[PDB]
Amino acid sequence: GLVPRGSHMRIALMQHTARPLDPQHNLDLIDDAAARASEQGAQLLLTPELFGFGYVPSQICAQVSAEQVDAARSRLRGIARDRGIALVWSLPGPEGPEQRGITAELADEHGEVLASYQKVQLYGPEEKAAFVPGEQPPPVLSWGGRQLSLLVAYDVEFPEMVRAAAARGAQLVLVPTALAGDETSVPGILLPARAVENGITLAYANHCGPEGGLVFDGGSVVVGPAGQPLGELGVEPGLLVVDLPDADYLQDRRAELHRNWL
Amino acid sequence: GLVPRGSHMRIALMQHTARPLDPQHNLDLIDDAAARASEQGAQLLLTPELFGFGYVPSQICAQVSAEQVDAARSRLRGIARDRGIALVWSLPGPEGPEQRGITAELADEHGEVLASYQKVQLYGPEEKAAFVPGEQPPPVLSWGGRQLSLLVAYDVEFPEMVRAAAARGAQLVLVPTALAGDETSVPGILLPARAVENGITLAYANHCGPEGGLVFDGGSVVVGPAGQPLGELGVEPGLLVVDLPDADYLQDRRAELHRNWL
Numbered sequence: 001g002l003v004p005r006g007s008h009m010r011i012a013l014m015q016h017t018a019r020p021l022d023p024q025h026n027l028d029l030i031d032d033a034a035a036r037a038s039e040q041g042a043q044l045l046l047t048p049e050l051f052g053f054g055y056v057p058s059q060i061c062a063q064v065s066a067e068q069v070d071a072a073r074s075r076l077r078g079i080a081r082d083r084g085i086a087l088v089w090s091l092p093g094p095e096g097p098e099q100r101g102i103t104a105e106l107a108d109e110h111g112e113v114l115a116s117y118q119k120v121q122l123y124g125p126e127e128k129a130a131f132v133p134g135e136q137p138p139p140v141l142s143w144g145g146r147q148l149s150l151l152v153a154y155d156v157e158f159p160e161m162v163r164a165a166a167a168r169g170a171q172l173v174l175v176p177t178a179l180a181g182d183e184t185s186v187p188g189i190l191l192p193a194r195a196v197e198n199g200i201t202l203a204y205a206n207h208c209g210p211e212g213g214l215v216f217d218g219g220s221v222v223v224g225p226a227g228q229p230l231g232e233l234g235v236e237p238g239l240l241v242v243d244l245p246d247a248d249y250l251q252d253r254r255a256e257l258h259r260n261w262l
Numbered sequence: 263g264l265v266p267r268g269s270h271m272r273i274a275l276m277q278h279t280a281r282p283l284d285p286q287h288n289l290d291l292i293d294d295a296a297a298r299a300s301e302q303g304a305q306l307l308l309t310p311e312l313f314g315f316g317y318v319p320s321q322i323c324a325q326v327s328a329e330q331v332d333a334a335r336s337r338l339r340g341i342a343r344d345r346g347i348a349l350v351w352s353l354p355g356p357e358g359p360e361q362r363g364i365t366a367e368l369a370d371e372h373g374e375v376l377a378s379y380q381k382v383q384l385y386g387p388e389e390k391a392a393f394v395p396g397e398q399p400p401p402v403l404s405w406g407g408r409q410l411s412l413l414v415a416y417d418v419e420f421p422e423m424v425r426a427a428a429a430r431g432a433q434l435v436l437v438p439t440a441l442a443g444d445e446t447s448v449p450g451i452l453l454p455a456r457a458v459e460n461g462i463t464l465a466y467a468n469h470c471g472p473e474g475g476l477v478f479d480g481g482s483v484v485v486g487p488a489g490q491p492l493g494e495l496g497v498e499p500g501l502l503v504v505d506l507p508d509a510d511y512l513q514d515r516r517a518e519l520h521r522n523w524l
Contacts (some may be wrong), residue, residue: 192455197421
């Protein structure tokens with residue numbers, strides 16, 4: 001609807017199927033979503049993990065070169081500046097195939113990448129074979145009047161990863177994801193706890209339907225600091241649009257003790 | 263009912279109102295609960311935080327001496343050995359009033375204390391004025407064929423505290439608590455995440471009804487590793503009895519990185 005009074009940030013999340021190894025089709029879908037999100041007044045569009053090439057880790061490692069990653073990356077920058085919308089996407093990192101990670105990047109509405117992050121917690125043996133884990137804490141930056149951060153898929157399942165962002169000041173954590181296997185407890189149990197336990201909002205954007213030998217769950221969601229969904233999708237494809245309204249665990253937490261007990 | 267085949271551990275949780283500064287009445291209630299739990303075949307009874315004296319931090323600090331704490335502690339050991347049931351209780355620690363913490367202790371069915379723990383995360387200014395925070399990680403010990411640990415009330419709200427126990431091998435974490443103010447997200451959102459994110463079972467035993475200027479929530483619950491309640495109470499007093507049946511976050515977690523990012 002109209003932008004509500006008492007809200008200054010309209011976000012969108014793209015939930016859709018990708019086609020393995022078909023970046024032209026996949027980036028056309030993000031372009032379409034970016035257009036529609038912008039026409040609904042969204043200032044940022046969040047897209048799923050590895051959407052550009054599909055969620056196919058071993059094939060990305062075997063058959064997707066750095067040049068082809070770089071090409072898709074340029075095309076996404078163009079979509080951001082071509083549709084006038086901040087964009088969060090996830091592709092492989094920019095190094096060679098056996099040296100790169102899974103990444104998430106944020107570009108502004110002009111087409112300039114402001115933040116990049118490499119997924120620290122890789123999920124399972126195919127992902128661990130195809131990609132190098134990140135070694136750096138999540139970035140936090142001012143955008144749209146709040147502190148944004150990025151994390152990718154399995155990361156958000158570790159309370160330590162979300163705490164790491166929130167400890168650096170994150171207020172909205174944007175998470176591209178690719179979750180299959182009807183794992184309802186990630187969005188239904190963990191996500192809401194991550195928001196409550198840090199007093200933050202998290203946006204989680206998944207694939208949905210059949211892709212690369214799996215069937216993705218959908219279940220894309222924005223969860224606010226009380227742990228309730230501000231908006232959510234089911235299994236069907238969709239563009240979720242949500243307006244963000246304008247115990248102190250972060251201070252109380254005895255970090256000194258808890259850093260040595262992990 | 264009868265002990266089910268495929269279960270070798272029957273636990274009980276006491277949810278009730280305590281009377282401030284009346285340990286004779288309060289310990290009679292734990293004694294009754296310990297009898298009834300034992301007659302239902304439970305091997306352990308979990309009781310709420312500071313039940314013995316009621317949840318009245320400033321009055322405990324002002325008016326409850328170490329001798330009176332020690333007296334209640336002896337009486338609880340006697341209940342364990344008098345009713346033939348392992349008992350988890352929470353009283354003030356044994357030092358002087360301005361030196362002691364909030365503690366939880368486990369005694370076996372014979373009347374011998376096997377573990378003690380001092381609450382690390384104190385909740386709010388009255389608790390922080392009345393008690394000294396603990397400095398030690400939660401204990402873990404074999405009992406009844408699994409690894410047990412202890413945490414108290416606000417502790418379990420920090421994913422770091424539960425991780426600390428689970429990292430030392432805890433499989434069942436027993437938590438006396440005192441939660442008021444209709445804070446439904448502790449048992450409804452955090453508790454289930456703590457179980458899922460560590461692949462453990464947690465038992466949480468609260469006060470209920472009016473006590474010491476507050477009205478306690480009840481909501482006592484046992485949550486297993488999939489995050490579902492094995493059993494739960496509402497607001498009314500009760501003795502919850504439950505039989506425990508007989509992603510690898512604990513291994514995958516990059517602790518080295520996450521210890522420096524907190």
